[PDB]
Amino acid sequence: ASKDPGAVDAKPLVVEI
């Protein structure tokens, strides 16, 4: 079970500035 990121599963956060 390689790596600690739910970043691959959970969707990326995109904030417009």
Next chain:
Amino acid sequence: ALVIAFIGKNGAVMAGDMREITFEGEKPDREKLEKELYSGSIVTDEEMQKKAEEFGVKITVADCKEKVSERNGVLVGEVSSAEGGVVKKRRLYASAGNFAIAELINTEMTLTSQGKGSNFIAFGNEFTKQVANKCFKDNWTKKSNLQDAVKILILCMETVARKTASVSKQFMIVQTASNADVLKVVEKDRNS
């Protein structure tokens, strides 16, 4: 895990932690530990080992993974997983006023989104994303420059590592002033 980036009109800054966690043991047990770790429940590396023992999961932690780099004026950040033979990967490409997001679907790194102008992008579990997003919105001001964005991303990375054992205290930061087209880099990666 956590990769964050700020894209501005004059450049882009990107920070990533260096923690890589491997789990070994029965699937229901690994799933129970994962849920506790990605929820912000486990704050210290001490509490992480005590929880792994409790659930009968052997855990190895490595804190030297370079998750960000700079190729041809384009910054590239990546988060990745391994679960039931499925390798998952997400990449962020950033330059001045330019960004793109690609995911590894099967054997191909596939573009899922992109944008122009100013943006803040956080890659992580639901907890690390909300914490970094809260830290950014709290310190960013409308006319802040790329130099202020460096200080802010350092504060985001420090605040997240204080709240969870899913991120390492050590982190990296890459920055660029180049406006190279990120879509060019995503194409180069598309194959292999």
